Design a protein around this ligand. Structure first.
Ligand SMILES: OCCCCn1cnc2cc(Cl)c(Cl)cc21
Length: 282
């Protein structure tokens, strides 16, 4: 079926939970043996969210190459994304090592450091120009260059230096700051505006390594971001935009990381975002 009318048909029939459970039943199951080794327990935020072995990002280290991060490679859309958990106190250096090694231009953050009174990820970037951060375990230096605070998101320019080679690179930090503590946004308008700002920066384009996107577990909000982007790109590329099947795209993405889209409300919000976004594109 088309999307917008499939949408009203699920609303009128109140069957979002049943649609979402079908997806969970059909989703791929692949091994995640490296994630479950005992030496990696303090590298995982949640025991039930792990990268598959076949698609995990490997650190360029011989001691321990493990990080909780996955490469989502979308062949028809010609887009790649790295989805990862919010960094932990003992993985902030690994996180920036990955950004460096994979040649990423942009980092997309969809959570606040504290939500619901609890910490959802480490404070992993510097907050003042004159107070830079040094990650001694991975030999990197990170400096805040500039910051632009808007009503729904903040964009930061960062300098990452590989202290071993003295090479430097500019990284863009796109921080969506207004996702509610509970539920999903009422309108997709600000989320779509944010997605377009990431696109306009070059961070999603083939002349750079894959964008790094995270929330707390790296599957819920993060899944919504890449699902909406890929679906809109396919609607631009195909002769028949109504052929794009958001449930099929989501199942394809779940071949590369488990659990993408965490609730039926996040599924409905993803539909809403693609539907509204397809009208603005034209
Ligand atoms: O090939 C399409 C180029 C222009 C698309 N575009 C630019 N600004 C946008 C803001 C929003 Cl909210 C949306 Cl949905 C789309 C946008």
């Amino acid at each position: 079926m088309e999307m917008e009318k499939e949408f009203e048909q699920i609303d009128k029939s109140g069957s979002w939970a049943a649609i979402y459970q079908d997806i969970r039943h059909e989703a791929s199951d692949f091994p995640s043996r490296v994630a479950k080794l005992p030496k990696n327990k303090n590298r995982n935020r949640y025991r039930d969210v792990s990268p598959f072995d076949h698609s995990r990002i490997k650190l360029h280290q011989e001691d321990n190459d493990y990080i909780n991060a996955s490469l989502i490679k979308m062949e028809e859309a010609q887009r790649s994304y790295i989805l990862t958990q919010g960094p932990l106190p003992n993985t902030v250096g690994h996180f920036w090592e990955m950004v460096w090694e994979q040649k990423s231009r942009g980092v997309v953050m969809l959570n606040r450091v504290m939500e619901k009174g609890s910490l959802k990820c480490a404070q992993y970037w510097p907050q003042k120009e004159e107070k830079e951060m040094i990650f001694e375990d991975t030999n990197l230096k990170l400096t805040l260059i500039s910051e632009d605070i808007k009503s729904y998101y903040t964009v930061r320019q960062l300098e990452l230096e590989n202290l071993t080679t003295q090479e430097t690179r500019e990284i863009l930090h796109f921080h969506y700051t207004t996702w509610p503590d509970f539920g999903v946004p009422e309108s997709p308008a600000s989320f779509l505006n944010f997605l377009f700002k990431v696109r306009e920066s070059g961070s999603l384009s083939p002349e750079h390594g894959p964008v790094v996107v995270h929330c707390s577990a790296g599957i819920g909000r993060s899944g919504t971001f890449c699902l909406a982007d890929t679906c809109l790109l396919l609607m631009d590329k195909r002769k028949d935009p109504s052929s794009v099947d958001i449930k099929k795209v989501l199942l394809e993405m779940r071949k590369f990381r488990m659990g993408l889209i965490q609730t039926a409300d996040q599924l409905r919000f993803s539909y809403l975002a693609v539907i509204e976004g397809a009208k603005f594109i034209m």
